[PDB]
Nucleic acid binder design. Structure first.
Length: 76
RNA sequence: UUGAUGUCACGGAACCUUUGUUGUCUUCGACAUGGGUA
């Protein structure tokens, strides 16, 4: 028994130009959601081992975002 | 709200002294963010 410490999906890499993760997404990038609770990761940095999930997306003025946090912390 | 045979109040400049002044280069590089793996 304990408490959940929920900070939000705040570990983000962002750029004006397309890096290695974005280049290899294989799809149409999603748009940035409005609600922080609906975000879900959509591929991996190490896609062989399936470690390190990320959420890749694009905004309407041309920035690219890679959110690389998927866990949240439990204090007990 | 006067009192009566007695009021110069047009009998008295709100006057006199005091510095919006003292100090300050239109300059300039390393910093943001929080996890991930066993």
């Amino acid at each position: 028994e304990g408490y959940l410490h929920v900070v939000g999906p705040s570990k983000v890499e962002f750029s004006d130009k397309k890096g290695d993760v974005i280049n290899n997404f294989q799809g149409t990038l999603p748009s940035v959601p409005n609600d922080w609770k609906t975000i879900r990761t959509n591929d991996f940095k190490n896609r062989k081992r399936k470690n390190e999930p990320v959420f890749c997306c694009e905004d309407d003025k041309g920035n690219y975002y890679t959110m690389a946090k998927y866990c949240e912390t439990f204090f007990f």
